[PDB]
């Protein structure tokens, strides 16, 4: 099984390749350069691992949330590749990706992901890894004001790890929460961390044809007022 | 050869395939008018989102419509600008990664060059050189065209484009956005001469345009006259007749100045029936020739991008792996 993953949902661009076990991965900050670096990085990862696009079994993309523009770059690039090489696609949550990264880095199994969404809000999720390595919490994904995050945290218990730029923009987000909070050491999603999630989704038959690939935006109220 | 063209500059998603032996093999279009009507304008974020939903499926329908497969396409063209950054990025990212996966050349196309070349999709297209009147939603320009990629700016609007002037006056008349075509359907019922509007920038030499004062002139007339159906029509006709005579006069001056005998008209306003008749008449009396596209190719479409990508490819304009769009991107 070969899986190719790409992510441009945040200030990072990353690509990663899974070859039946061995991982090859690149990651970099690309503020204002996503569209310039992404396809060169795909090319390089394919050539350095001596694999061609036609030998990939599935294409995993960062489906959101994040920068609207970044999320669309990601899905657009993934769709072009998948349409062109007739690849099935696997959409991976940006918040879940960062949780997988905290697991990889320090074995965290309870992750509070917060992404700065702008507009004084964050993209929020509560992910918990089960004994079989499955992440639970997809249903908790939401865009929320910091005061609402505060109230939600007071309904949680115990010990959690923090990941995402939302904690960086609001370092007191977890103040008076009642939880023990530790830094998860993950600011941004990495395509490397999509691969294990994408691997499990592929095993479950949970892939889609290119025309069904969907972005997840979370903030949907994005229009100026309608006319009378 | 065959080129797949992708247009996502604003609020239309267009996909087409153009074959330089057999012509246009596929044309697919999704207009977002319903979505933006509610807002009285295009919401960039909503336009961007809808392109994501339409682009891939319209590409698939195009290949289905043409009975072609991936190996039959020699290049992928996509609009790189001008237009809305967020919309442009959808077409350009799909288009550029698609070309990478098919391993064929990727062609960034200038949206206005797309409009300019649309009349080349009809029988007996224009030879160089010619004057071109680009009259669209956000552009109004006169251009001396002496060859491929050889564009010289003769004149342009210093304020509103003619398309927007139609839209603004149409809204004042209480019509749905964009009302250009609707205003035009209303004008047909009006009696010529009932009101007479100014022909802006015609009492001095020069090839530039202005439409802002004409808008106010019509707005003042609407305010100080009856809102009955016949009076509304008389105003729409005076306005359209003013715009059409202005463009005609400027085209005349541009033909006089260049000495060319061919007039090419492009962009959405060139679907206007009064304007087509007026410019055809003028070119008849000059013993010259007018060229324009079928109405559905005057406004946005992918056909014009597949053609213009074909032309840009033959002229050597290909993209590296980096993708860039240019929201503002001067033609000439
Ligand atoms: N029959 C008509 N009479 C007058 N104006 C018309 C007619 N048909 C279309 N238009 C105008 O053409 C404009 C849109 O044409 P077009 O699609 O070329 O603009 P566009 O895609 O926005 O290009 P640009 O980016 O330069 O604005 C609108 O303002 C519309 O009302
Ligand atoms: Fe246009
Ligand atoms: Mg348009």
Rounded-to-integer distance, Cα A113 and Cα A97, Å:
9
Both B94 and B159 in one domain: the answer is no
In SS3 terms, chain B reads as CEEEEEECCCCEEEEEEEECCCEEEEEEEEECHHHHHCCCCCCHHHHHHHHHHHHHHHHHHHHHHHCCCHHHCCEEEEEEECCCHHHHHHHHHHHHHHHHHHCCCEEEEEHHHHHHHHHHHCCCCCCCCEEEEEECCCCEEEEEEEECCEEEEEEEECCCCHHHHHHHHHHHCCCCCCCHHHHHHHHCCCCCCCCCCCCCCCCCCCCCECCHHHHHHHHHHHHCCCCCHHHHHHHHHHHHHHHHHHHHHHHHHHHHHHCCCEEEEECHHHHCHHHHHHHHHHHHHCCCEEECCCHHHHCCCCHHHHHHHHHHHHCCCCCCCCCCCCCCCCCC
Q: What is the CATH number of the domain that holds B82?
A: 3.30.420.40
As given in the structure block, the two tokens for residue B32 are 């977002």
**Residues 48-77 in B contacting A (C-alpha not used; CB under 8 Å):** 48-49, 52, 55-57, 59-60, 70
Rounded-to-integer distance, Cα A47 and Cα A37, Å:
16
Both B242 and B180 in one domain: the answer is yes
In SS3 terms, chain A reads as CEEEEEECCCCEEEEEEEECCEEEEEEEECCCCHHHHHHHHHHHHHHHCCCCHHHCCEEEEEEECCCHHHHHHHHHHHHHHHHHHCCCEEEEEHHHHHHHHHHHHHCCCEEEEEEEEECCEEEEEEEEECCCCCEECHHHCEEECHHHHHHHHCCCCCEEEEECCHHHHCCCCCCCCCCEEEECCCCCCCHHHHHHHHHHHHHCCCCECHHHCCCCCCCCCCCCCCCC
Strands A159-163, A180-183: pairing is parallel
Resolution limit in angstroms? 2.3
CATH number for domain A94-188, candidates 3.30.70.270, 2.40.30.10, 3.40.1360.10, 3.30.420.40: 3.30.420.40
Please check whether residue A75 is in contact with residue A82, taking contact to mean a CB–CB distance below 8 angstroms. Answer: no
Q: How would you list the strands of the sheet with B289-291, edge to edge?
A: B150-156, B140-147, B130-135, B262-266, B289-291
Give the chain B residue whose CA is nearest to the CA of A35.
Answer: B323
Q: How far is CA B259 from CA A181, B126, B256, in A?
A: 78, 16, 5
Rounded-to-integer distance, Cα B105 and Cα B96, Å:
9
Please check whether residue B304 is in contact with residue B60, taking contact to mean a CB–CB distance below 8 angstroms. Answer: no
Q: Domain span at residue B94?
A: 1-128+294-332
Q: How far is CA B255 from the centre of its chain?
A: 21
Both B14 and B84 in one domain: the answer is yes
Kindly list the residues from chain A whose CB atom is less than 8 angstroms away from the CB atom of residue B321.
39-40, 43
Please check whether residue A207 is in contact with residue A20, taking contact to mean a CB–CB distance below 8 angstroms. Answer: no
Q: Which pairs from A26-31 meet CB under 8 Å and 24+ separation?
A: A26/A191, A27/A190, A27/A191, A27/A192, A29/A188
Kindly list the residues from chain A whose CB atom is less than 8 angstroms away from the CB atom of residue B97.
39, 42, 76-81, 84
**Ligand 2 centroid from CA B219, angstroms:** 26
Rounded-to-integer distance, Cα A91 and Cα A27, Å:
19
How far apart are the CA of B43 and the nearest CA of chain A, in angstroms?
A: 6
Both B147 and B88 in one domain: the answer is no
Q: Answer whether B43 sits within 8 Å of A222, measured CB to CB.
A: yes
Smallest CA-to-CA distance from A114 within A188, A15, A27, A49 is with: A188
Smallest CA-to-CA distance from B273 within B195, B197, B185 is with: B185
- The residues whose Cβ lies within 5 A of ligand 2, an ion, are B 136, 300
Please check whether residue B15 is in contact with residue B24, taking contact to mean a CB–CB distance below 8 angstroms. Answer: no
Both B140 and B197 in one domain: the answer is yes
Smallest CA-to-CA distance from B318 within B136, B108, B56 is with: B108
Of the candidates A36, A69, A76, which has its C-beta nearest B94's C-beta?
Answer: A76
As given in the structure block, the two tokens for residue A149 are 């995050």
Kindly list the residues from chain B whose CB atom is less than 8 angstroms away from the CB atom of residue A70.
none
Please check whether residue B170 is in contact with residue B178, taking contact to mean a CB–CB distance below 8 angstroms. Answer: yes
Please check whether residue B239 is in contact with residue B216, taking contact to mean a CB–CB distance below 8 angstroms. Answer: no
Choice from B132, B137, B188, B267 to test ligand 1 binding pocket (greatest atom count within 8 A of CB):
B137
Q: Answer whether A35 sits within 8 Å of B70, measured CB to CB.
A: no
Query: Residues of B forming the annotated binding site?
Result: 111, 115, 134-138, 167, 180, 272, 300
Rounded-to-integer distance, Cα A68 and Cα A89, Å:
20
Residue B55: CB atoms within 10 A of its CB come to 29
Residue A142: CB atoms within 10 A of its CB come to 18
CATH hierarchy code of domain A1-93+189-228 = 3.30.420.40
- Asked whether this chain's domains A1-93+189-228 and A94-188 adopt the same fold, the reply is yes
* Sequence-ordered list of residues with C-beta below 8 angstroms from that of B150, at least 6 positions apart, any chain: B128
The region that residue B3 occupies, defined by phi over 0 for left and psi between -120 and 50 for alpha, beta otherwise, is beta
Q: Which residues line ligand 1 (CB under 6 A)?
A: B 10, 83, 111, 115, 136-139, 163, 166-167, 178, 180-181, 184, 267-269, 271-272, 299-300
Both B124 and B136 in one domain: the answer is no
Residue B57: CB atoms within 10 A of its CB come to 16
Smallest CA-to-CA distance from B211 within B267, B272, B165 is with: B165
Q: Answer whether A39 sits within 8 Å of B100, measured CB to CB.
A: yes
Both B190 and B287 in one domain: the answer is yes
Technique used: X-ray
Q: Answer whether B93 sits within 8 Å of A224, measured CB to CB.
A: no
Q: How would you list the strands of the sheet with B2-7, edge to edge?
A: B23-31, B12-19, B2-7, B75-81, B106-110
| End-to-end CA gap in chain A | 55
Both B153 and B193 in one domain: the answer is yes
The count of domains in chain B is 2
Of the candidates A43, A80, A222, which has its C-beta nearest B95's C-beta?
Answer: A80
Both B286 and B308 in one domain: the answer is no
Q: Answer whether B323 sits within 8 Å of A38, measured CB to CB.
A: yes
Smallest CA-to-CA distance from B113 within B301, B331, B326 is with: B331
The domain locations on chain A are 1-93+189-228, 94-188
As given in the structure block, the two tokens for residue A169 are 């923009």
Both B94 and B192 in one domain: the answer is no
Burial class of B212 by CB neighbour count within 10 A (0 to 12, 13 to 18, 19+): middle
Of the candidates B52, B97, B323, which has its C-beta nearest A72's C-beta?
Answer: B52
Adjacent-strand bridge partners of B7 = B14
Rounded-to-integer distance, Cα B269 and Cα B144, Å:
19
Q: Answer whether A53 sits within 8 Å of B40, measured CB to CB.
A: no
The region that residue B249 occupies, defined by phi over 0 for left and psi between -120 and 50 for alpha, beta otherwise, is alpha
Both B186 and B313 in one domain: the answer is no
Please check whether residue B109 is in contact with residue B225, taking contact to mean a CB–CB distance below 8 angstroms. Answer: no
Taking CA A128 as the corner, what is the angle to CA A124 and CA A134, rounded to the nearest 5 degrees? 115
Rounded-to-integer distance, Cα B115 and Cα B137, Å:
12
Q: Answer whether B94 sits within 8 Å of A80, measured CB to CB.
A: yes
Rounded-to-integer distance, Cα B150 and Cα B130, Å:
11
**Ligand 1 centroid from CA B131, angstroms:** 20
CA torsion angle B183 B270 B13 A30 (round to 10): -110
**Ligand 2 centroid from CA B306, angstroms:** 14
How many CA atoms does the CB half-sphere of B292 hold within 13 Å?
25
């Amino acid at each position: 099984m070969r899986i190719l993953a790409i992510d441009t949902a945040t200030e990072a661009c990353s690509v990663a390749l899974w070859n039946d076990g061995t991982v090859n991965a690149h990651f970099e900050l690309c503020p204002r350069e996503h569209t310039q670096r992404i396809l060169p990085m795909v090319q390089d990862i394919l050539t350095t691992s001596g694999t061609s696009l036609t030998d990939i079994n599935a294409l995993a993309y960062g489906r959101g949330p994040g920068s609207f523009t970044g999320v669309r770059i990601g899905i657009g690039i993934a769709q072009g590749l998948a349409l062109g090489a007739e690849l099935p696609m696997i959409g991976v949550s940006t918040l879940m990706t960062m949780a997988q990264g905290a697991w990889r880095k320090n074995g965290a199994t309870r992750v509070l992901a917060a992404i700065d969404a702008r507009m004084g809000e964050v993209y929020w999720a509560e992910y918990q890894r089960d004994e079989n390595g499955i992440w639970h919490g997809e249903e908790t994904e939401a865009v929320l004001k910091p005061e609402i995050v505060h109230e939600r945290m007071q309904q949680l218990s115990g010990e959690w790890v923090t990941v995402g730029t939302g904690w960086q923009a609001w370092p007191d987000l977890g103040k008076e929460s009642g939880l023990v909070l530790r830094d998860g050491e993950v600011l941004l999603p990495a395509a490397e961390d999509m691969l294990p999630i994408a691997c499990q989704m592929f095993a479950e038959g949970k892939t889609v044809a290119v025309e069904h690939a969907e972005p997840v935006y979370l903030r949907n109220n994005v229009a100026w007022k309608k006319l009378p | 050869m065959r080129v797949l063209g992708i247009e996502t500059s604003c609020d239309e998603t267009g996909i087409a395939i153009y074959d330089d032996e057999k012509g246009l093999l596929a044309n697919q279009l999704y207009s977002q008018v319903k979505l933006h009507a509610d807002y009285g304008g295009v919401v960039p974020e909503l336009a961007s989102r809808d392109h994501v939903r339409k682009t891939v499926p319209l590409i698939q329908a195009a290949l289905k419509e043409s009975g072609l497969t991936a190996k039959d396409i020699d290049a992928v063209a996509y609009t790189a600008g001008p237009g809305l950054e967020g919309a442009l990025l959808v077409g350009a990212t799909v288009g550029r990664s698609l070309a990478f996966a098919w391993d064929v050349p990727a062609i960034p196309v200038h949206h206005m060059e797309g409009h300019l070349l649309a009349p080349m999709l009809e029988d007996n297209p224009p030879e160089f050189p010619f004057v071109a009147l680009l009259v669209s939603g956000g552009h109004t320009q006169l251009i001396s065209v002496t060859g491929i990629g050889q564009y010289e700016l003769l004149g342009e609007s210093i304020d509103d484009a003619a398309g927007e002037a139609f839209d603004k006056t149409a809204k004042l008349l209480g019509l749905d956005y964009p009302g250009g075509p609707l205003l035009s359907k209303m004008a047909a019922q009006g009696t010529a001469g009932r009101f007479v509007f100014p022909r802006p920038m015609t009492d001095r030499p020069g090839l530039d345009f202005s439409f802002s004062g004409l808008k106010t002139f019509a707005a003042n007339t609407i305010r100080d006259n009856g809102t009955d159906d016949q009076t509304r029509a008389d105003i729409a006709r005076a306005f359209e007749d003013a715009v059409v005579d202005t463009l005609m006069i400027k085209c005349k001056r541009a033909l006089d100045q260049t000495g060319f005998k061919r007039l090419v008209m492009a962009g959405g306003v060139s679907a206007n029936r009064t304007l087509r008749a007026k410019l055809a008449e003028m070119m008849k009396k000059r013993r010259g020739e007018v060229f324009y596209a079928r109405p559905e190719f005057c406004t946005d479409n992918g056909a014009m991008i597949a053609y213009a990508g074909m032309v840009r490819f033959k002229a050597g304009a290909t993209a590296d792996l980096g993708v860039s769009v240019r929201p503002r991107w001067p033609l000439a």
